[PDB]
Amino acid sequence: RTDPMVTLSSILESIINDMRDLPNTYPFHTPVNAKVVKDYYKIITRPMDLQTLRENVRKRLYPSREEFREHLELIVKNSATYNGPKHSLTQISQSMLDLCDEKLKEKEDKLARLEKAINPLLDDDDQVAFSFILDNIVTQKMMAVPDSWPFHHPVNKKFVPDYYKVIVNPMDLETIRKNISKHKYQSRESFLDDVNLILANSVKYNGPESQYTKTAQEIVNVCYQTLTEYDEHLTQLEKDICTAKEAALEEA
Numbered sequence: 065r066t067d068p069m070v071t072l073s074s075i076l077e078s079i080i081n082d083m084r085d086l087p088n089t090y091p092f093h094t095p096v097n098a099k100v101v102k103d104y105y106k107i108i109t110r111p112m113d114l115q116t117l118r119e120n121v122r123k124r125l126y127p128s129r130e131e132f133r134e135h136l137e138l139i140v141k142n143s144a145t146y147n148g149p150k151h152s153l154t155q156i157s158q159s160m161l162d163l164c165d166e167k168l169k170e171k172e173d174k175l176a177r178l179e180k181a182i183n184p185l186l187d188d189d190d191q192v193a194f195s196f197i198l199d200n201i202v203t204q205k206m207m208a209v210p211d212s213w214p215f216h217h218p219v220n221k222k223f224v225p226d227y228y229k230v231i232v233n234p235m236d237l238e239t240i241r242k243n244i245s246k247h248k249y250q251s252r253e254s255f256l257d258d259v260n261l262i263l264a265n266s267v268k269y270n271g272p273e274s275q276y277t278k279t280a281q282e283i284v285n286v287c288y289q290t291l292t293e294y295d296e297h298l299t300q301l302e303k304d305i306c307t308a309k310e311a312a313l314e315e316a
Contacts, residue, residue, distance in 0.1 A: 068181040068316045069124050075175065076121045076132050079167045083136075083160040084114055092139055092157060107146055112138040114160075128179045129168050136164055177315050184312035190304040191247050197294065197301075198244045198255055202237055205290050206259075209282045211275070212237075215262055230269050235261040237283075250309075251302045252291050259287050 084093060094115045096104045105111065112135050126132040140161050143154040168175065185191045207216060217238045219227045228234065235258050249255040263280040270276045291298060 066316065068178045069127070071316075072126070072128075072175070072178045072182065073121050073124060075171060075178075076126060076129075077118060079164055080114055080118050080121065082167065083163055086156075086159055086163060088152075088156050089114070089160060091153060092143075092160065104146060108142045110138060111142060112136075114139075127182050129175055133161075133164065133168070136161055181312045181316040184309045185247065185250070185305065188305070188308060190301050190308065191250070194298070194301040194305060195244045195247050195249070197298070198249060199241060201287060201290050202241055202244070205286050206283050207237060209279060209286060211279050212283055214276060215266075215280060215283060224269075227269060231265045233261055233265070235259075235265060237262070250305050252298055256287070256291075259284055 083089065092114055095113050096108070096111060098105055117132075117135055117139075120126065120135065121132070126135075140154065140157040143151065143157045147153045180186070206212070215236055218234060218236045219231075221228055240255075240258050243249065243258065244255075263277070263284045266274065266277040266280040
């Protein structure tokens with residue numbers, strides 16, 4: 065019932081404590097001082113240090129060990145580039161990376177359980193499959209409605225005066241496809257919330273009798289009809305997505 069991001073961040077912060085405690089890590093404790101380390105930020109355009117890593121941990125920027133380790137490995141790579149691949153400082157930065165990898169392997173199982181609770185739908189095939197059919201509904205059914213082209217992309221403000229003053233939540237099929245590609249929709253309800261906005265917005269701006277509103281109504285109707293045709297399939301995916309979220313949290 066605890067926040068897994070907190071448990072993950074305490075684990076990462078204790079790794080920084082141990083890395084900071086290794087012999088001769090002093091130069092990696094704080095950001096490089098541009099005023100005395102010649103040309104450093106010309107040569108090193110992606111800098112990293114243990115102070116910045118600890119700040120990032122406390123800001124909850126790492127949802128997994130991978131993102132934490134990639135920033136840590138930057139410390140080694142930057143030392144190799146600026147000091148040299150065999151410089152003693154690069155060997156010292158490598159001793160920090162090696163300790164980290166021992167600590168992470170040591171806590172493999174608990175970290176895995178926390179990572180899945182922080183991101184239950186990561187590489188979840190039910191979510192990918194659900195987004196896959198939503199996208200097909202948009203491209204094969206909704207965009208095939210005749211004269212639907214004015215809804216395929218955001219309204220062009222230059223030709224539609226005051227649109228973005230009248231319409232506070234604009235929506236269009238390209239934006240819905242972008243949301244699908246980021247897996248915004250975990251069930252058909254939030255998908256339909258955005259689809260219905262295309263019609264509601266045309267009613268507000270064009271009125272209920274407009275040819276554009278009739279077209280939007282057909283887009284909405286074919287969306288509902290297609291969700292209904294695939295109800296059993298979609299319900300299975302929705303159920304699996306929902307129960308995976310909650311199961312991930314329980315294993316925390």
